[PDB]
Structure formats: C-alpha cells, structure tokens
Symmetry: C5
Subunit: 310 residues, 5 copies
C-alpha cells in the first residue's frame, strides 16, 4: 500500500558500520555488519499530537508501508533485524534495521603489497506508481564505530556519493546510491616474511661469483632457485588470477631471470675453463659480481617507478 | 488454484544477471544473483479499469495463482525474494523476483589454460490440469549488468535458446528453457606464474649437456626434476580429475619425458666415459644439445596443433 | 490423523535423481538432488467423480494425512519442497516432493585408483496404530536423468532392492528400503599425474647402478626418495585413514623398500670399494641392475594379483 | 503450564544414536544424529479409556506441557524434529524427537596414534515450581545402530551413568545425566604412512657411519633431517596444541636428537681426520654404528614403557 | 509496550559461560555458549500474592515487555533460546536465556608464543521514551563452569566492569557493559615442535665452521636455510598479518641473518683460501665459532628483554 503523493518520494538513507571483517583477497569480498537508517514522509499517517497518545507512535513493520531497499552487490540477500520504527506527527517515518551482508567489491592488486582500496556498498530501490529516489543524510552515515577492525588494513574513511544513479531497468525506474569504504593495506608483515627473505636467498644465490666449483656452484644456484619457487607459490596463493600484472608479480618474475642468467654464467664460466682459456672465465666471473647487483638495483627502480612513480 | 483456459498456458521468462561470482573450477559450479521475470495471462483477474482503482493492481503472492519455476541444475533450492507483482486489466500478470543460486554446469578443460566455456541455467515448470510451456522474452533477458565480474574470466554473452524442451516426466509434461552464459578464460597470469617458469627450469635442466661432472650433472638434472613436480602438483590441484587429457596435462607430462631421457643420456655419457671410449660420450652429448631443444619445440607444435589446430 | 484400515498400509516409493555431485572421498559423503514419489490408498477421501469437481483434486499438504518418510543415512534432515499432491477418486494419493540431501555412504578403497562403489540412500517410515510398509514402484524409480554428473566417476545404474527391511525399533515397527547407486571410478588422470611420475622417479633413482660416485649416488638416490614423499603425501591426502591396506597404499610402500635397499647397495658398493676389493663391489652393482627391475616387476604382479586377481 | 504434583517430577531419558560422524581431532568435536526418548507422568491428562477415543491419544507439542531438555556441551542449540507424542490413560507421556547436534568433548592425545577415547553427551533440565530430576531407561538407550560409522575409530559401547548430577545453578536446581560413547582409535594407516617411513629415513640417515666423505655424509644426514621435518609438520598438523606431551610427540622429538648427534659425530669424525689422527676418527665411527641403533631401540622402550606401561 | 516509570530503568545483567571453544587466532574470534540473566522492575505487573495464583507467575515472552539486549561485537545476531521468565509480586521480572554467539575480540600477538589475552563480550541496550541503563549483578555473573575448555589456553577469570558506558548514538542514548575473559596461552607444544627444532637446525647450520669443503659447507648451510623457511611458513600461517612485530617474528628473522653471514663467511673463507693466504681463512673461521654462538645468545637476550623485560 504505497504513499499517495504528488511527486518522487524521497527516502533518506544512512549506514553505520558497527563491525567489518573477513576481507577475502582471493574471493574479492568482505563482511559488514551495520545500522541502516531510512526516512520518508507518508502524510497518510500524520497524527493529531494532542487528540491521542504521545509524541511519536511505534509501529510493527506489518502495519505501515515500507520501501524495499535491496543491496546491489551482495551474494545472497542481506540479513536484517529491525530495531525501531518511529512515526512523527507530520507523517514522517524513521526506520532503523541492523543488517549483516557479505559484499562483493573488486580490488586493484596492481601494487599488491602496497595497494589501496575502495570498497562499495550499493543500495537500489525499485519504483511503482510513484517514483522513488534515494539520498544520503550525513548524521546517520557518520557510520563507522571507533572500533572497526578489518585485520590487515587501515581504514581511511566511510562515505557516500550524495547524487544517486537513476537507471530505468525493466519498464520501471530505479535509484542507486554509492557508499565508499576507503582502505589501504598494512604492508609490513610482508617484509620480514616475504620481501627480505626473497632477497636474502637471491644474494646467497649469486655468492657463486666468488666460487669456482661448478658442483658447489650448481648446488648453490639451484638450491636457491627452489627456495624461491617456495616463495612464488606462497604468494601466488593468497591472490586471485588477475589479468593484469601485480607489482610483487613482476619483481618475483624479474628475479626468475636473475637466476636464469646466473645459471647461464656459472655454466659458461666452465665450458670456458675446461676449454683451456680461463683468461676469459675468471674475466666474466669478475664482471658478474658487478653487473648483477647493479642491473638488479637498477631494474628495480625502473619497475618500482613504472608502477608507483607513474 | 490454476488459470482455467482453452489451451497451453504460456509463461514468458527472462533473466537479468546482476552479480556473477565464485566460479569453482574444482567443484564445477558458479554463483549467480539475478532478476527473474515471469509473465502470463490469467483472465480470471481482468479488472474494469474505470469502475475502480487505477491503471494496475499490486498483489501479495498469497493472493494470486503463480507458476512454480524451479531451476534444474542447482544444489539446494534457489534463494528468492519477490520484487513486484503487477496485474494488468486484460488479466495479464507481471512477476519479478530477485534470486541467488549456485548453479552446477560442467566445464571442458581440454584446452585448460586457454579454454572457453558455456554455462547453463535451466528452468523447468511442471504442468497440472492445463499444460504449461515456458518461453524467452528478450527485453527482460538482456540480463547482464555492465558490471558483471567473474574474476579470471571474460564474459562474452548471456542469452537463451528460444525453443523450449518439452519432456514428459512422471505422468506429467514439463517444459525446460536454456539460458547460456558464454565465457572464455583469462589466461595470462598463467604465463609469468606457471608456463614460463616451467620452461626456464627445463632449459636449465639440460644445461648439463655442456657439462662433464656426473655429480654436477645429477645435482643439475635431478634438482630441476623436483622443481617440476612442484609445478605439476600446483596445477593438478586447482583442477578436477578429468577422464580426458588436458592441454597443460600433456605438455606437463611430455616434459616429464624430457627429464627421463635427459637423465638417461647423462648416465650413458658416463658408463661410456669410464668405459675407455669418450670418442662416443662427447659425441652423444653433442647431439643431445640439438635433438633435445628441437624434438621439444617440434612435439610442442604436434601437441599444440593436435588440441587447438584440430 | 492416520488412514483407518484393516491391514498394513503400503506406501509406494520412487526416487528420480536429477543432480548428483560433491562425492567427498575424505568425508565419505555425496550430495543428491532428486524427486521423491509416494503413493498410498486413503479411502477416507474417495470422491464421487460426477457429483462435484473434476477428475482429480489437488490438496495443500496441511489438509491430508501424509506419511513421514525420513532418510536414514543423512547428516541433517533432508531439504524438501513439495511439487504436487493429487488425490484420485478411489481414495488414492499421489505425492511428489523434490529434495536435496547430503548422504553418508561408506566406500571401499581397497583398489583405490581402480575401485568401484555402491552408494546407498535408505528411507525408513515409522508406524503408529496401523503398520506401515514401504515398497518400490519402478516407473517412478527409473530415477536418473541422462545428465547426471558426479565428476570423476562413471555412473553405472540407480536401482532399489524391492523387499524392504522390517525391524522393530523402540516399541514400534519400522520399514526400510534400499536405493543403490552403482559407480566405478574414472582412473586415468591418476596415470599421467601420479602413477607414471611415481615410476619415472623410481627408475632414475636406480640409474645409480651404472655410477660409481657415492656423492652423485647419494645425491641421486636421496633426491628421488624425497620426490616420492612428495607423492606419498599428495595421495595420502585425498584419502581417509582406512584400517585396511589400499592398493596404491601397498605399491607406494613397496616402493619405499626399493629405495631402502637401493641406498643399502650404494653404501655397500663403497665400504667394499674402499676396502681394497672392488672385485666384489662392481660385482654386486652388476646384479642390482637386474635383481631390482625384476623383483619389482615381479612383486607388482604378486601385489596386483593379490588385490584384483583375488 | 507445568504438572502439579506432590514431589520431584522424574523424566525418563534415552538416546539412540542413528548416525555418528565428523570427529574433528583438531576441533575436539563430533557430530551425532540420534533419537531422544522422554517420558513422565502428568496425571492432569489421564483419560477414561472407555468413555471416548481409543488406547492412546496423539498430541501436537503445542497442546501439552513438555520439559525442556537442553544439551550441555553443544556449540549452537541442538537441531530437533519431533517424531511422536503418545499419552497413556494413567497420564503418562511418551515423547520422541530426532535430533542432530555437534557435541564438544575433550580428547586425551597422550597416546596419540594408540589412544582410546570416551565422548560425552550431557543433557540438563531446569526446574521451576516443582523440581525436575532426569534418569536413564535402558531399553530406550540401547541407542546405537549396528551401522554406526565414525571413520577412523572403533566404537566400543554407548551407555549412560544412571545417577544424575544435581547442582543448584542460579537460584534454581538443575539435573544432569552422563551419556558415554567409548571409542578407541584405528591406528594402522598410521604405520605404512607415518611410523615406518619415519624410521626408514632415520636408518638411511645414519648409513653415514659406513662412509667417509663429509660431502656425501652431510648430503646424507641433512637431506633426511629435512624429510623428517616434512613428517613432523604433517603430524603436528592434524593435532591440537596440547599442554602435555604426545607419545608420537616424544618419539618424534627423540628422533630430532638422533639427528643432532649424528651430525655431531660426522663433523667430529672430520676435525679429527684432518687432524692427523684417524686412529680416533674411524674409532668413533665404529662405535656410532652400535651405540646409535642401541640407544634408540633402548630409549624407545623407556619411552614406550613410560607412556603405556605406566 | 515499555514500563512507565519516573526515571532510568535499570536492567541487571549477568553472564554464565557454559561452553568456550574455537578461538581462531587467524580470524580473531571465539565461540561462546552461556546463560544470560536479565532483571528489571515493571510495577505494571505487580500481583496481589493472596488474591490469586501462587508465589510467582511464569510468562511466555510474547506477553510481557522485555528489553532488547544485543551484543556489540558479534558476527551475525546472537543465537538464543529462552529458559524461564519469572515475575515476582512487587513487579520484578527474572529473565533467563541461553545463547551461543561467535564473538569478535582482537588479540595482542606481541609476545606470540608467550602471550596473554583479554577477550570482550559487550552488550548494549537502546532506549526509547524511558532511558535504559544496564548493570552487573555478580551472583549471576560468576559465569564460568568448572569445565570451561578452550583448547590451547588457560582461563584465568571471567568478570565484568561494573560501570557501564553511556553514549548517545543516533538521537537516542545507549548503555554498554564490559564482560572480560582473561586468558594466557599454553605455550609448550611450541617448544618440542617449533622452538627447539628451529635452534637445532641453526646449530647444525654452523657446524660448517669446523669444515673446509665449500661443497659440504654450502650443502650444509643452504639445506638448513631451507628447513628454516619450512618453519617460517609453518608459523606465519597460524597467525594474522599484524602491523606490529611478533616476538617469534623477530627471533625468526634474526635467525635469517645468522644464515646470511654464515653463508658470507663460508664464501669468504674461500676467496681467501684460493687466494694463496689461508693464514687468514682459517683465522676467520676460528672467530666465527665464537662470535656466532655469542652474538646470538647475546642478541636473544637483547630481544627477549626488549619484549618481555620492557
């Protein structure tokens, strides 16, 4: 039984995150638990403050007409429990539920360990005989407890784009709002646990430039090549199959090359030292010790700049 | 209370994907969240436009007769929430729910990293005293937001096969529709992460054709053989037990052979160099360096052609 | 309100699988989604075909007495949605639900990669003042779509044991039916992915019978011993802790022995070649090259026969 | 509306396991699915056998007063479906539900691979104006189908401790019953898969007592030390963080010592053989070959006895 | 229908844990199952003890006004079942539910294997026309069975902060209570399983200070470096991505350095022993054997003190 009116019924929205959690990098989802604030005028139930009852009248949801606000990007329907409906004399309604959804918002892994993200909760509403348009009220959208968790991320700001998006979808017009949760990753645990060890074993790897024993040089270079696949797989595991190239994706693949030519060199510093001309072998081996740790530190700047600097 | 009529009641369908996600290669499933559009004529509730009310009349689902449309290939029942029922004067109904199912459609891993797929949502409807036949209406089936995700895949087109399939199943006739979602995989992340490294360690492996030390030649060939099991298992892990042979399945097994004979050669370039006739050893070792990287590049064409070229 | 009668009320059953899936080897379960067909005579609602209505009368489940059929081997209760109840004039009821359960049926991993299985869905019904006995009607039990999936298995035949099992259980008699789903595994992907590689690395392993360098002989035999634990664990992982011995369980343990004595030999072809009598060392080493690949191929027949041949 | 009476209302209980499953070692839980039998006298509904109806009268649960029996050790509430309520003339009620809970009972991993366990389902009932006391009736508690699964365990006996435990808890008295499920583990698959291989690689490890090449002696002893961490982690993984010491916990740590001194010896059988006095080196190396496999077999008895023998 | 009164309605709370379990370190959650005790005065239902009925009157929840107590830090809504409502003559209510939630409380991994924690359950209540304030009653909050499990932790004490926290949140005042569960970890299983083995392989690692063979010195130092990544990953796995530095996080990274310079030394005790001046090589090698095991034991004190001592 919708509210008879002369024009577009405006419904004022507002979210208040109470709990964030389980941001699943692989899945590209996260779980929220917040307040939802709705508010419209339905003069059909204005009420003679003096003639009866008191200041405001409480209603069971079954009694009044209430606008269906569905979330757009959600897995299964949202999971809500109604907190208070309060009707004011002029015919103004004050709705308040407490929901918990798992929301589906893409991420940009282009700077993976150093990335920043911007999550979206959507909210549309479908119209009938009267057009409905949503809109943000900011005192009910300061939504964010001073206790919002989200392990592994720093939460920067929850806000909404005031102007809504009004498609026509299936011979009826809908109205959509944008709620943005801005977060940056907490990279750090990434250093002592992935970054440094990935370098350490790369340095060791090419300690075999101050060595002459092919045996201890393949035992050296190959054993590290393995420990680095150990890392490649570890990282390529808590990460989805992007169709672009990650930052940690490149410097992990670049490092596959500094193993290939490393193994080239040690193999050539050999079919050149069995060939009776070590004049050259321990001439190449000498350059390696310099061209390697430079071309690395040099390409890492090229790569680093390519991603963040640009 | 079904709609008394002279013939087969036709119910016009239409899906509109709003959200795709969680295509589980192992499981052979995916999760959809879309609009469902139904529409039939039930003259039993034609309504005297002028004598009362307005243009259309809204009903609660409890009030009218509504056709049960069940999905065929789904795990547990579909998970729906009703959006609007609108009855037009002639006795025409306009149904619209918003469901979320996890659908079960097979995939063809024959070209695994370079495969294309075609997912199915099915929709049957069981008849009673009057036969029901379904059918697609295409303005309600343009179903696909310009935001449909599906990580790891490019979505090519959502459509339906207009003619339905009319079995008789259990002393009553049913009618089935085919909705097709065409996708191709985003192979790429497969290259820097699986393909190239699988080659790199294969090349290194047979660097021991320019080497004479059995010790550094088994330390060479065997350590790579291991790093390749590391890859075999990684890949054979995000993939179900097909009864056919994958593409990546072959070139991963072919590569097991280029390790076996590699280890054969180095073992024969030895019980032939301890046997006082290295005339032959460093005669075989010489061919290897050519027959190997050719027979590979050559069989890879044979294999590649066998799968895609045919 | 049960159906007053002179004798055992017979209820005719029939299952029709629509979807099979998620056979969990570890868990020993699988998920089905089928039709359930019930049918009994309840003369209490015979109906004067001519005096009113039509051929058959449809009822809401709340209206009639319906027999509770529970599944015996299920995790939580079954998950059903009712499709049509049709009462015929003589007082005959025609029930039809569509359920989805996850069923719990043991498997026999005695021939693991080459096993055949026989799954069970059970169905009992508890009696009250009148005894209930179930029984199979085969036109409603041809249950199996021509599209039944079950990744990794070939489905051989769905059927039911016509005679039911009538216990007395808790001062009331119950009646149980046996529905059998016969499947054999699709072994294959097991070959290029587990079987062959397990052999390959075993052959390589004992390439060190044509080698004299303890160092390259321990680097040889030990590195493969490792790659085989890689396989042992991979396999012992998608498999439950049977109290019997798997086929792949034996030939994976037998192969642990052909590594132990391999390492024995190479260690004895040494404290016998440092002991100034290689007359014997390269006398033992010679036999190895024959006794090994024979005792293997020979025990594999003994083992293979022991399991399948018997 | 409780049953007015002169004294403690006695409610006769009885469980009948129908399905056991998913005993989660890590979690310390298991999932049951059984019958629950309640039975009390509520004279308030004695009923004149002759004056009306028949032998017994069936009731919907809404109609009579029924005692709330809650399980004590359960995760979320139990999950029940009511099977039959039967009231006898004297005013005796016969309740029967079929529930499925996941129960939380500790285990004793002190003999891990050879342990025996004793699971508990608890059952309390809270009193009001009349005291309630529970108690076991054994014909309704022979609860255990001849088909109870529980993969990996042998089920020894389901029983109940007849005397209940009557606390006063929160200004009201409660009554608690003990149902005991006695199981012992099926150790076996533990042998071919963990125990033997853990020994095999330990023997190999100290094959380097009949060897002189430090290189092949560190390649020998260290490569096995690794394969044993492979096992340590595998086992320490399907097991919770006990604050006591497991059996398999000790003999897995003892074995870490027979690697440490192994590596000590081979390192001392070297800074004593480069030290121009091998008189001693191949004097120590000789003892090792005996003190090792004895001190092992000897401590294993000490340890084995310490755990089981005591 | 709230209780008309002159002032802030006080509602007396009290929790009684019955079951603790599934403290998920990674997730930062735990699962509780306890009693909830509420109690307020609602004179509106005072009752003439003598004129009718008895001492106290039992009510169904539908009948009286009951205050909604929601938990603040919970995933989805709490999961409750009502145990008894008892109204006393003065108009005093006695509520008692039994709930099960999974609670979300942060942890402090700063001393990881030796940490102590303090979990929180929160409880707010929203006011309407009359202000509500909560408060703890301690005879109903002795909440903790003498059987509370929580595998892996010692439970120290369950208590509540008597003074509540009274925000104004969304044009209405709320009142919040603090329930604290104090636990310390059971570190131990951490020693035989992680700590000791991490040291053992570190000692072995630098056994190559009494060795001269680069080959057996890289085979020595590198093979252990690997076994330590085995441990790094094992530990970094049952632990969330803290933005601070764990204790076990440091001494696991410090140990990465005692591998780096270890590998430095052995590589320099070589390009100094091939350069014809071993005067220095076996001069450095000599210091190593002392500076290493001292700088370790020394920094471990610095680190240990830094974390616990401060």
């Amino acid at each position: 039984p919708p509210p008879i009116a002369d024009e577009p019924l405006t419904v004022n929205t507002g979210i208040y995150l109470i709990e964030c959690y389980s941001l699943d990098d692989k899945a590209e989802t996260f779980k929220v638990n917040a307040f939802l604030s709705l508010s419209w005028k339905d003069r059909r139930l204005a009420f003679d403050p003096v003639r009866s009852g008191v200041r405001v009248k409480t209603y069971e949801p079954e009694a009044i007409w209430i606008p269906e606000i569905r979330f757009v990007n959600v897995e299964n329907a949202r999971d809500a429990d109604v907190v208070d409906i309060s009707v004011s004399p002029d015919g103004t309604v004050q709705y308040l539920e407490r929901f918990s959804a798992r929301v589906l918002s893409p991420l940009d892994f282009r700077r993976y360990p150093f990335d920043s993200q911007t999550l979206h909760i959507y909210l549309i509403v479908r119209s009938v005989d009267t057009r409905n348009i949503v809109l943000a009220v900011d005192l009910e959208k300061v939504g964010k407890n001073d206790d919002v968790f989200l392990t592994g991320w720093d939460i920067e700001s929850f806000t909404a784009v005031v102007k809504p998006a009004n498609f026509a979808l299936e011979d009826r017009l809908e109205s959509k709002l944008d709620y943005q949760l801005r977060i940056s990753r907490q990279y750090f645990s990434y250093i002592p646990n992935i970054i440094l060890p990935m370098l350490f074993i790369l340095f060791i790897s090419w300690t075999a430039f101050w060595s002459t024993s092919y045996e201890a040089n393949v035992t050296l270079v190959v054993s590290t090549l393995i420990a680095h696949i150990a890392f490649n797989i570890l990282v390529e595991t808590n990460l989805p199959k992007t169709p672009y190239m990650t930052y940690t994706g490149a410097i992990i693949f670049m490092i596959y090359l500094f193993y290939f030519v490393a193994v080239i060199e040690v193999t050539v510093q050999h079919y050149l030292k069995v060939e009776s001309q070590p004049a050259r072998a321990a001439s190449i081996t000498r350059a390696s010790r310099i061209a390697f740790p430079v071309v690395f530190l040099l390409a890492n700047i090229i790569l680093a700049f390519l991603f963040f600097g640009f």
